[PDB]
Amino acid sequence: EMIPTEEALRIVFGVSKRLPPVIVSLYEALGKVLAEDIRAPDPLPPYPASVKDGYAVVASDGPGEYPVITESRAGNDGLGVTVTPGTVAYVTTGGPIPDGADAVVQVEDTKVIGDSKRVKILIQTKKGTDIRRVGCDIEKDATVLTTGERIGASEIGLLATAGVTMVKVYPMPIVAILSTGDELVEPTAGTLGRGQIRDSNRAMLVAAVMQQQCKVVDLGIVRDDRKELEKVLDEAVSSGVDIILTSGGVSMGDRDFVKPLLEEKGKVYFSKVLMAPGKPLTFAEIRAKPGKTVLAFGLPGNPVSCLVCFNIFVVPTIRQLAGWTSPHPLRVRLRLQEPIKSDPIRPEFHRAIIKWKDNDGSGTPGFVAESTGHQMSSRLLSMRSANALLELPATGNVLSAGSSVSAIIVSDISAFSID
Amino acid sequence: EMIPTEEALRIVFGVSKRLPPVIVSLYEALGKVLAEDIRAPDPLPPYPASVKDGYAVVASDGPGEYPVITESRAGNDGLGVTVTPGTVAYVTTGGPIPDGADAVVQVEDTKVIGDSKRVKILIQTKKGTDIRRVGCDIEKDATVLTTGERIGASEIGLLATAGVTMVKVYPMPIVAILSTGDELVEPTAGTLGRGQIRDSNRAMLVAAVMQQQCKVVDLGIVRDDRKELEKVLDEAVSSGVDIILTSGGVSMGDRDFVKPLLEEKGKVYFSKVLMAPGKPLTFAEIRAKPGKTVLAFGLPGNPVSCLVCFNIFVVPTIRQLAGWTSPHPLRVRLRLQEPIKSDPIRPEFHRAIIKWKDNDGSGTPGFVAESTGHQMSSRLLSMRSANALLELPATGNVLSAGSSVSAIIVSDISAFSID
Ligand SMILES: Nc1ncnc2c1ncn2[C@@H]1O[C@H](COP(=O)(O)O)[C@@H](O)[C@H]1O
Ligand SMILES: Nc1ncnc2c1ncn2[C@@H]1O[C@H](COP(=O)(O)O)[C@@H](O)[C@H]1O
Ligand code: MOO
Ligand code: MOO
Ligand SMILES: [Mg+2]
Ligand SMILES: [Mg+2]
Numbered sequence: 001e002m003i004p005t006e007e008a009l010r011i012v013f014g015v016s017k018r019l020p021p022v023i024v025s026l027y028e029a030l031g032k033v034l035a036e037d038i039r040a041p042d043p044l045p046p047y048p049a050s051v052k053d054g055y056a057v058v059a060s061d062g063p064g065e066y067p068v069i070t071e072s073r074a075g076n077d078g079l080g081v082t083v084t085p086g087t088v089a090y091v092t093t094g095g096p097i098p099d100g101a102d103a104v105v106q107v108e109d110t111k112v113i114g115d116s117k118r119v120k121i122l123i124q125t126k127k128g129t130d131i132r133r134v135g136c137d138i139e140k141d142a143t144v145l146t147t148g149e150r151i152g153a154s155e156i157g158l159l160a161t162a163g164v165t166m167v168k169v170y171p172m173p174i175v176a177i178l179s180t181g182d183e184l185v186e187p188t189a190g191t192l193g194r195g196q197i198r199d200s201n202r203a204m205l206v207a208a209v210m211q212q213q214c215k216v217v218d219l220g221i222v223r224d225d226r227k228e229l230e231k232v233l234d235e236a237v238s239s240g241v242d243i244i245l246t247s248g249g250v251s252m253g254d255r256d257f258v259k260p261l262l263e264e265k266g267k268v269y270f271s272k273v274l275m276a277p278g279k280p281l282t283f284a285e286i287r288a289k290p291g292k293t294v295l296a297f298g299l300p301g302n303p304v305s306c307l308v309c310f311n312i313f314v315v316p317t318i319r320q321l322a323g324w325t326s327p328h329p330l331r332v333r334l335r336l337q338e339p340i341k342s343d344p345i346r347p348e349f350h351r352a353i354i355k356w357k358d359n360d361g362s363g364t365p366g367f368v369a370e371s372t373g374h375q376m377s378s379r380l381l382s383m384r385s386a387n388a389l390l391e392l393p394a395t396g397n398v399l400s401a402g403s404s405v406s407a408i409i410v411s412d413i414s415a416f417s418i419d
Numbered sequence: 420e421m422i423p424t425e426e427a428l429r430i431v432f433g434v435s436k437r438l439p440p441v442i443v444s445l446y447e448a449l450g451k452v453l454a455e456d457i458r459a460p461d462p463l464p465p466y467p468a469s470v471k472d473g474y475a476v477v478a479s480d481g482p483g484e485y486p487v488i489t490e491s492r493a494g495n496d497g498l499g500v501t502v503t504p505g506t507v508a509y510v511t512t513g514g515p516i517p518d519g520a521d522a523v524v525q526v527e528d529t530k531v532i533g534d535s536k537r538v539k540i541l542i543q544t545k546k547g548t549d550i551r552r553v554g555c556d557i558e559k560d561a562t563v564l565t566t567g568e569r570i571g572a573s574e575i576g577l578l579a580t581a582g583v584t585m586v587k588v589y590p591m592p593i594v595a596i597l598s599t600g601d602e603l604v605e606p607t608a609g610t611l612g613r614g615q616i617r618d619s620n621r622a623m624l625v626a627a628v629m630q631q632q633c634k635v636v637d638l639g640i641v642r643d644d645r646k647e648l649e650k651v652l653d654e655a656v657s658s659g660v661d662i663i664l665t666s667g668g669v670s671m672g673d674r675d676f677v678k679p680l681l682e683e684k685g686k687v688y689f690s691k692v693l694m695a696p697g698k699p700l701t702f703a704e705i706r707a708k709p710g711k712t713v714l715a716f717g718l719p720g721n722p723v724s725c726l727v728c729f730n731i732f733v734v735p736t737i738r739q740l741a742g743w744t745s746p747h748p749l750r751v752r753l754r755l756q757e758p759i760k761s762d763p764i765r766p767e768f769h770r771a772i773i774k775w776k777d778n779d780g781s782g783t784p785g786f787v788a789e790s791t792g793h794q795m796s797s798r799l800l801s802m803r804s805a806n807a808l809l810e811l812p813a814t815g816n817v818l819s820a821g822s823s824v825s826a827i828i829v830s831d832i833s834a835f836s837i838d
Binding site: 026027030031041042044045046047049051052053054072073074075076077079090092093094095096106107108132136137138144145149150152153154155156157158159160161162163164165181182183187188189190191192193194195196197198199200201202203204205206207208210211224251252253254255256301302303307310325326328329330331332333356358364365366376378379380381383384385386387409410411412413414415416417418 | 460471493750783805829
């Protein structure tokens with residue numbers, strides 16, 4: 001009944017569907033994937049523009065003293081004026097080139113003469129120098145952005161260039177989160193009573209979903225009572241969320257009602273994965289009453305297993321729903337800074353702190369990994385500062401320091417601390 | 420008057436000061452750097468906890484049939500009951516181990532006997548098996564998080580474990596943004612008049628600052644009038660922001676008032692950097708009237724130069740103000756997928772799309788880079804999809820395909836599209 005992670009991932013990918021596109025404002029489009037192509041309605045620059053502060057000249061005139069017949073910085077400056085041979089115009093960078101001028105001489109290659117305005121051009125320039133012709137940066141009707149492209153700051157800049165302030169994008173999924181267990185108390189609890197622990201998974205998962213830029217619906221702690229969990233799941237399913245995340249209540253306990261309830265409400269595709277940590281992971285698809293599908297992840301209760309399963313299975317599902325064409329995490333190859341013993345049955349997602357070094361140990365640059373120590377699934381300190389999961393195959397052998405392994409990068413690579 | 424980028428960066432680092440710490444709620448602490456150590460007020464688990472669903476036994480009893488004297492899942496279950504030799508207790512994962520039991524036998528190694536409750540233990544277990552002793556995951560008073568540590572989802576989980584819902588952190592800086600130019604129109608403009616372009620830098624910088632998780636104060640378009648820009652800068656300086664970003668008005672134009680105004684209001688440390696793109700970058704420190712310092716970046720107007728300067732100089736300043744101990748960007752080494760001509764004077768921050776390959780061209784894994792094409796500073800399409808800036812030294816020689824270069828990673832490495 002235990003499936004490999006690669007098959008569990010394929011199943012999730014095959015069930016997960018891109019959400020219907022929506023229209024958002026400019027700053028709401030940041031971080032989203034475009035659901036339409038964007039075409040420039042006019043060229044950039046829309047007028048021949050100076051690259052420099054200086055003088056617009058007729059290049060064939062060459063060096064000499066000339067009257068300054070207009071000044072062109074913006075708008076209608078120099079409208080109706082023709083720079084004829086034997087004249088020049090002052091220009092600032094981005095200023096429209098007056099008719100008749102065919103090159104710009106930067107101010108450093110000129111000198112103002114006299115105490116009316118006259119200037120000495122100190123060089124022989126070439127036709128077209130320091131002029132941006134109409135549309136040289138962006139041609140009118142060119143496609144500046146395409147469908148399936150994620151919007152970052154430069155793409156916001158291109159949308160603003162093209163005058164697009166309402167954008168068609170794929171939305172982020174809305175995610176409901178709950179915790180299960182009679183042992184749980186809220187994390188505001190002070191002195192714990194006997195047999196109680198603070199609910200850490202819910203806040204951890206709320207934060208994890210906030211890092212994925214999705215809206216969170218926090219459904220709180222649910223006790224180990226089948227009727228109660230059914231009511232919360234029925235309410236989560238009908239609320240309009242796209243994903244439901246539960247943690248706990250999915251092992252072999254006599255009060256673990258997540259799996260049987262997901263079996264009753266929808267289709268469970270799997271409930272056990274061959275992996276360390278994260279064995280009791282359940283995945284289901286539930287149809288909400290009319291009109292849409294809801295994906296449910298019955299995450300394991302052990303804090304480490306909970307976050308690892310979120311990182312490996314939930315993040316790519318969020319990205320797929322959000323229209324990402326490349327939802328898979330970044331996988332790199334790296335060298336171990338210390339020896340690690342692999343398990344003989346379950347492949348391990350071993351937590352590590354990775355960094356780029358000029359010498360990775362082999363004499364050339366590369367990533368290196370330090371284990372976070374003891375990997376027990378109950379030990380959330382093993383996730384502390386972990387920016388990667390080393391994919392250790394189930395060989396049972398000690399992988400020595402300096403051996404090469406594959407690693408899944410789980411936290412912003414541009415936020416990596418340097419060596 | 421033109422300083423190397425490394426010196427411009429050192430100056431910015433030496434002037435930039437970490438902001439005073441603040442107290443925020445749990446979910447507000449996400450993405451922030453801790454400004455206090457966090458100690459566990461109680462152990463995890465606070466009671467001896469079962470690792471499995473099954474039966475708590477006296478290990479020395481060994482295999483046999485035994486009465487089930489209590490059931491322990493949470494809270495006060497089994498309080499006052501002693502598991503004596505010849506008895507067992509039912510336990511669920513995370514359930515408190517009753518007094519007297521010293522090992523757990525998972526339910527798969529047991530069988531319920533009879534139609535009162537009796538169970539057959541099918542194995543010989545060892546003392547301490549499948550029990551988490553008090554504090555084995557986290558010891559009472561252990562430091563679970565330290566000052567200078569950035570808070571991600573696992574660190575939120577550790578704060579919730581320790582019952583911390585109000586956290587001392589370094590805040591993010593508040594950033595004011597404005598654009599300058601008589602040629603600019605709002606990006607809502609439809610048909611452009613002569614000599615007008617849409618303001619793209621402001622939205623681009625607003626988005627860039629939003630990606631850095633800072634609050635934005637949008638000060639709009641300012642015209643090329645010294646008195647007007649002075650009023651907006653005086654108002655930005657006195658508003659409570661920590662950083663002011665302007666773009667444009669910093670080249671050699673006769674109406675470029677950013678540098679002289681920053682010289683008049685504060686201390687300009689530099690106004691020209693030896694780099695391609697981004698030559699006219701100005702940096703100043705202004706004291707606000709009582710009581711604090713404001714950092715001002717006079718960013719270049721050319722869209723590419725504007726974003727590149729933001730990425731290289733502003734991002735690490737934001738991170739330093741926000742208490743990051745490693746504010747520098749991730750720098751990797753990679754192989755070029757195509758030839759690139761380097762400039763003979765100015766070192767270039769060449770935009771590229773980088774990806775990790777199993778074969779980088781040299782036969783071993785590594786990053787490879789594709790140029791985004793023409794690198795003119797007016798061409799914002801050169802930033803499109805650019806996740807890195809290749810640091811090309813000023814040699815004037817053609818760096819062929821397959822040569823190794825240093826690259827600054829500018830966009831989330833965990834958001835990288837795979838090969
Ligand atoms: N929300 C939670 N936060 C912290 N630990 C949890 C949470 N839910 C379950 N656990 C623990 O995870 C383990 C497995 O839980 P379960 O799958 O409900 O048996 C037990 O040790 C639970 O006490
Ligand atoms: N906000 C803006 N958005 C787009 N282009 C700009 C902006 N500000 C300045 N520019 C252009 O950048 C170049 C340099 O501007 P400046 O430094 O003001 O001379 C000129 O081509 C300007 O038209
Ligand atoms: O059963 Mo696990 O893989 O320790 O959550
Ligand atoms: O003067 Mo630049 O380096 O094209 O902004
Ligand atoms: Mg439970
Ligand atoms: Mg200007």
